[PDB]
Amino acid sequence: GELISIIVPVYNVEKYLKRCLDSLLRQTYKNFEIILINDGSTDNSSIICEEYAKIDNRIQILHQTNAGPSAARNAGITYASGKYITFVDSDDFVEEFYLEHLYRALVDNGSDISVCNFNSFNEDRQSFLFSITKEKYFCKNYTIAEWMDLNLFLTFTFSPTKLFKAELFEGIRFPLGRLREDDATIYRLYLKASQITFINEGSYYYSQRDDISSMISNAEERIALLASMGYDLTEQIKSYKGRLKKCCEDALRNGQIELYQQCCNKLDLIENYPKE
Amino acid sequence: GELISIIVPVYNVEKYLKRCLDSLLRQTYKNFEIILINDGSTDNSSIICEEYAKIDNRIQILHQTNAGPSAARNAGITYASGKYITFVDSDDFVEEFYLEHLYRALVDNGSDISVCNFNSFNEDRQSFLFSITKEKYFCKNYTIAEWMDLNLFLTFTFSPTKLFKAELFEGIRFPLGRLREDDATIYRLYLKASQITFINEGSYYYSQRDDISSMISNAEERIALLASMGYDLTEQIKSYKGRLKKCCEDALRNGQIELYQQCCNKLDLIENYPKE
Amino acid sequence: GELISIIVPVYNVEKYLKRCLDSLLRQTYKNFEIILINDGSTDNSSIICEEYAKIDNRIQILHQTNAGPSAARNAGITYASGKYITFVDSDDFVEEFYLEHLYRALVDNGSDISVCNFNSFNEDRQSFLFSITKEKYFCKNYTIAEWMDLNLFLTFTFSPTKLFKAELFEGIRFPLGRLREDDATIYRLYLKASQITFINEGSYYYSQRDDISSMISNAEERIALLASMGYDLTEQIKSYKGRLKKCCEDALRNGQIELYQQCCNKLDLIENYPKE
Amino acid sequence: GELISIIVPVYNVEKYLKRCLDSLLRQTYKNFEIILINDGSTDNSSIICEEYAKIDNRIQILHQTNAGPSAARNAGITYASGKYITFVDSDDFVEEFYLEHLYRALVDNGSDISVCNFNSFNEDRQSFLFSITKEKYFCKNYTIAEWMDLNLFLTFTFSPTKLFKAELFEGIRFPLGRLREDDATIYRLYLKASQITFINEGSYYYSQRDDISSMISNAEERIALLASMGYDLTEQIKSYKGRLKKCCEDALRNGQIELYQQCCNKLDLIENYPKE
Amino acid sequence: GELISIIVPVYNVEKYLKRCLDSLLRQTYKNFEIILINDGSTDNSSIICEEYAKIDNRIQILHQTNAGPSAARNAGITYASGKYITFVDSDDFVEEFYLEHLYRALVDNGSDISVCNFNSFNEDRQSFLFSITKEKYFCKNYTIAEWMDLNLFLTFTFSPTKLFKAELFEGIRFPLGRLREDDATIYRLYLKASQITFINEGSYYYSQRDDISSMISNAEERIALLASMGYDLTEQIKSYKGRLKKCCEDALRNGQIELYQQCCNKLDLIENYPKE
Amino acid sequence: GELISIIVPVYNVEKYLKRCLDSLLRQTYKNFEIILINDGSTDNSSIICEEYAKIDNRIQILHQTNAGPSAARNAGITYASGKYITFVDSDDFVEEFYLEHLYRALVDNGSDISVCNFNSFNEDRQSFLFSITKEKYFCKNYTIAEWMDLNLFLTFTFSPTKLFKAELFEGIRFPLGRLREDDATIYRLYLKASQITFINEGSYYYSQRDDISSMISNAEERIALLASMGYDLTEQIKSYKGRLKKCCEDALRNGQIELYQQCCNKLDLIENYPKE
Secondary structure (H helix, E strand, O other), rough: OOOEEEEEEEOOOOOOOOHHHHHOOOOOOOOOEEEEEEOOOOOOOHHHHHHHHHHHEEEEEOOOOOOHHHHHHHHHHHOOOOEEEEEEEEEEEOOHHHHHHHHHHHHOOOOOEEEEEEEEOOOOEEEEEEEOOHHHHOOEEEEHHHOOOOOOHHHHHOOOEEEHHHHHHHHOOOOOOOOOOOOOHHHHHHHOOOOOEEHHHEEEEEEEEOOHHHHHEEEEHHHHHHHHHOOOHHHHHHHHHHHHHHHHHHHHHHOOOHHHHHHHHHHOOOOOOOOO | OEEEEEEEEEOOOOOOOHHHHHHHHHHOOOOOEEEEEEOOOOHHHHHHHHHHHOOOOOOEEEEEOOOHHHHHHHHHHOOOOOEEEEOOOOEEOOOHHHHHHHHHHHHHOOOOOEEEEEEEEEEOEEEEOOOHHHHHHEEEEEEEHHHHHOOOOHHHHHHOOOEHHHHOOOOOOOOOOOOOOOOOHHHHHEEEEEEEOEEEEEEEEEOOOOHHHHHHHHHHHHHHHHHHHOOHHHHHHHHHHHHHHHHHHHHHHOOOHHHHHHHHHHHHHHHOOOOO | OEEEEEEEOOOOOOOHHHHHHHHHHOOOOEEEEEEEEOOOOOOOOHHHHHHHHHHOOOOEEEEOOOOHHHHHHHHHHHHOOOEEEEEEEEEOOOOOOOHHHHHHHHOOOOEEEEEEEEEEEEEOOOEEEOOOHHHHHOOEEEEEEHHHHOHHHHHHHOOEEEEEEEHOOOOOOOOOOOOOOOOOOOHHHHHOOEEEEEEEEEEEEEOOOHHHHHHHHHHHHHHHHHOOOOOOOHHHHHHHHHHHHHHHHHHHHOOOHHHHHHHHHHHHHHHOOOOO | OOOEEEEEOOOOOOOOHHHHHHHHHHHOOEEEEEEEEOOOOOOOOOHHHHHHHOOOOOOEEEEEOOOOOOHHHHEEEEEEOOEEEEEEOOOOOOOHHHOOOOOOOOHHOOOOOOEEEEEEEOOOOEEEEEEHHHHHOOEEEHHHHHOOOOOOHHHHHOOOEEEEEEEHOOOOOOOOOOOOOOOHHHHHHHHHHHOOEEEEEEEEEEEEEOOOOHHHHHHHHHHHHHHHOOOOOOOHHHHHHHHHHHHHHHHOOOOOHHHHHHHHHHHHHHHHHHOO | OOOOEEEEHHHOOOOOOOHHHHHOOOOOOEEEEEEEEEOOOOOOOHHHHHHHHHOOEEEEEEEEEEOOOOHHHHHHHHHHOOOEEEEEOOEEEEEEOHHHHHHHHHHOOOOOOEEEEEEEEEEEEEEEEEEEEOOHEEEEEEEEHHHOOOOOOHHHHHHOOOEHHHHHOOOOOOOOOOOOOOOOHHHHHHHHEEEEEEEEEEEEEEEOOOOOHHHHHHHHHHHHHHHHOOOOOOOHHHHEEEEHHHHHHHHOOOOOOOHHHHHHHHHHHHHHHHOO | OOOOOEEEEEOOOOOOOOHHHHHHHHHOOOEEEEEEEEEEOOOOOOHHHHHHHHHHOOOOEEEEOOOOOOHHHHHHHHHHOOOOOEEEEOOOOOOOOOOHHHHHHHHOOOOOOEEEEEEEEEEEEEEEEEOOOOHHHHEEEEEEHHHOOOOOOHHHHHOOOOEEEHHHHOOOOOOOOOOOOOOHHHHHHHHHEEEEEEEEEEEEEEEOOOOHHHHHHHHHHHHHHHHOOOOHHHHHHHHHHHHHHHHHHHHOOOHHHHHHHHHHHHHHHHHHHHOE
């Protein structure tokens, strides 16, 4: 099959990196490159990266001065030469059929993007949580409009579990020096697609063991864009009000006083001064 | 009549301050206080403020360490003891009936805000531009919904020309260390009101002689807020698209590269990827 | 009686704030406002402030970006609308007759300031230290000259225990970004007064559990000021020499070398080169 | 005669340095060293220093990273090996008998310090101002007390025109990174002396072509020291009030708002609330 | 022929960029890409880049936040997909046969690098200086040892005029934030080669109209490398001694005192303490 | 005998300082000064320095604002008035005949420098390691060429154990803010000498309980100097290659990515592209 570029930012993940990389090299889909972006790690991560590159030529390492998760992913996008691009966090790990299932779902359906789900691995108790079961499996093709009504963490704020045509990345980059960088970026990729295929299987494992300002501004930017493009706003509005409520309280708890004022005011307007 | 608080930020306006203050002391509406906020001026402005305070007891001076126009206006709001609050920029000036007309328009109509228009004074040629003529005079009461539809500068980005019930300022402050502060704030006051009265009268004179990131952020926040409150988005969407175009080009010219990418991508999505 | 404004700076005092506020709400003198200035606390203090504000309308909260104890007290003074102003630290607490006794001492004597004493509460052993006993109770009126002669901590470095006519604060603010702020400020209030009434009563409880440069600067400024106003300097001189000794040794221990040289030189001049 | 160390800080004085150094090498008193401290000059001053050192072995150069006039003088004091120390600014120049007259005045009278006066040279008009004339010449021995009652620029804030026994410098250094460094330092040298000899001759020529905070704190520190040592305060008090008046006005003009508040308050206390 | 990547850093060169780009698009060698790295220009350079990109698809633009000439070139190297890499400064321009002649000289000779010379253009007088004439034309193949035995500016400190096999860039990047970045880098590419071909034609035009520390450390690094690899040091030593002389004087003129001390000491050792 | 200046930098060594100073005051060679440079210590070191100064007048203290070990030693060199200069680290201690043996070895041989060896003391186990035994004692006079042909730590990167003619320090200072400051400096003193005497006795005790960039640049600077002066480079090259290997690996482990790139490239050139 055609080349898939797997972008893996690496920053101080010495405990988890080998499990991640082992799960990737065992992929049943063979035609991939793994772009490891070592973002200036200060533990053994960089040495682990180098050792893995020595035994599999599909691994390419990029060492860079520490610049954040956004910069690391952008470097990956730049270096990628695949027809498709996908992200894996170096904290996490996948089933051996992960890539193949994503690839088939995309290509067989003529979609521009395929997306799967994730199950959880609790590091503290070394136990899986199989939230997504075989009996609950489904697959569906979605228009962008149908897609934008749908799990909000999975869909909008989590960069892995998703296979993208590389062409979709024209003009699209993660925002620098900013957390919730996934929240600000992934949905812009969806907006460039014509069809998206979702497979409800937890083939990606999320290892289970911030930025209030971005939480709010990401949601505002996204509402403005969707509104300008003619998409329905109902769910984003619900999401936005929920974030404002969290921001209002947490900003105050964190001594982020100007942010607290803004969020409480916005919440006050929405709840107490709606139209009519 | 009831006390009107006039908030006047002062930063290095020695050439224009006396003209401003003279035009305010000549007001036919006499029950006011002028709150001069000297934002750490380094010219003669502070001395001019002190001299005017000595001859009229309606003038109150606040000297503060330089912190920007938003901080200066916020100090004004905090110090105001009037039933109503209005803003005057210290390089502008007004007709002697300015305050009286705004006060009448508000109180006689049972509105929460009254708004007038402005004409221009060209400092370079010392000539007035009477864009707003007596033949074009009108007055009208608006619902908030009617008011929000469309002079975008007069309505949303310009803080003077407007008389606000002081009660409207609960939870509302200008955003710190950041220009287009009026653009981020005035419309939130409108959203608190039940009715607004406009008088199409150029009684305020704007003396004629960029924060590109805020231009975009302000518009996104405002769309998200209006959408969440059920207001129509048609004109804000048009305004947003126009700002994106301006941003896309000007950010690039200024070497603001990440801003440029974000705006160009947003403009690309809107123009080339609207909902199918 | 007339309104007393109680200014209470709050920064990360979650363990002690409730005890403080409970003791204030139980005041037998009921015509007060409590101005809580949350100086950007990062613990639960801000939430505790909000909860108390919901149950007593005499409580006014000001949330501000963290700027230090001087800035917080200055905001308090600016916001106070009382005829009298008093300070309470948020880790301390008071007798239920605290305010009443200070108010009586001031008003019945025609003084401009009344001052009481304090006893101690040892948090580590949960035990009171009643240094000031009923057998030692006295009350006395003082001229400013009598007052300035000498408990140096109680009088000059401690802002609570004192009820001030609000008029005394014209031109007087705590110095920004700088500790021993009380040491720099309280005595300037005394200098504005005509008479001070002291009550030797430990009605305030100080919870028991360095800015070396300011220690010296404050003492030099105060001597210069008193000398310029014709006050006797004998005790201030003794205090200054004691501070120089402390400075000379502690600056050196802290690696504050230029401060050390300055203080040692000053101490050397005073002890070894007095006027022949 | 015994060795005199002449300390000459040099910072960007290319236009004036040769005139200064020429006037020094022509001294009738031959036993001197000139310590040129080049404080990281960025013009030709450093090259001029090196060229002069090549032709007279009494010149010693010390090049140092830019650190200010205080640091440059302190380096000079440290390098000095003379029995006496004197300062010359590299902007200025002297008569050929300058050093000899200072030396004789000190040694013949058994004084610890000798001081002369200065006349002016107006660079803009290339003309001398002989303010100090031959007919006005006098010489006098002073006790420290007599000395401290006396021209305030000449005596207290100007480091040149003065020959000091080197022993007087134990523990005494110019304050770092601070202007009016002379104001803070010279009088401490006087306080270590037993007798001072003044000669009223303008043998030093001051070339005629800031720090408000230090102006005030230097005067406060000096009053506190003098008071502690038992010296009369009358003139220092007059001086202090004059500085407060200048500070109050100039701080405000410069946007130094906290300084303005402090100085105006101090002036208000002194003028309007003196004892009784 | 095979693809040549031309790396063109662009920072604030609006006056010269069109001339540069016009001369490149007129190349007789057709198979190239021009990688324009706009390094956050703040003039019209970015817009000029965009306009040229629209009319010739061999032009690729990378806009980046300003990070300096080294970072710009490194981005070019990373983006380059040619078999050969060459550098052109956007201030300069070339003959229409420039690329073709470099290409032939490399390929026909089996060299890894080809190098030509340059003539100059005086912008102030709009006149060419034809230092390299037709009569002085020669071409020659060199071993690296012969090559490293040489003017000095052309060979080591100037990145254009040179066509490199792209494989030579493994592990070689320009040093960040550093000026004299060419000085630190070009020679390392030479050391990777087996044979270099020089053509003595001035087909590149240098438009004519310092980091002292790097000048010295670059020469020291280069001597240490060459010595470690067994190359002859005679000319590098001569060059190093010349740089020390320049540094010794110019560091002092610039107030770079520690650098002055180091260079003067080094020059002192070399000239006055050679081996016995 | 003539005065030996012992330079002892002191920074936060309260646990070890008394042992150091006791061992120095017990020297059989009596004519020394100990220059204690307290570099702004924040423990009890400064007070320990003062106490020792009070009981032995050979001890001089310089207190300075913290500026690092290089600045501390340079201050020592400046203050030193001895005919000879030696360094002792305040963590360490010496035999009672330490100074005497160094002095005799220098003076009896007509050398400019004498050097001894060191044994170690393991603080964790309170036990001596006598690496240098009586049986292995030797003494020898070396030419500089013989001297520069050598362990490596003792000779070049350790400042104690060495007695220098003070005239050798002309133009030689330790580099500011730099670690491996000994590495950059000691060898330059050797290059000033005509003959060096080594005594193989461990009379200095090193108490036992990295700046990668300097490690590399120091070695490059030293190779360039030695090459320029005609000394043999064989051992320095071996040392340099060893440092590159260490840097290549450890820079990467520390996230020092540009340094890693430079060192790995240098090592790549040396090992894989030596001269043909």
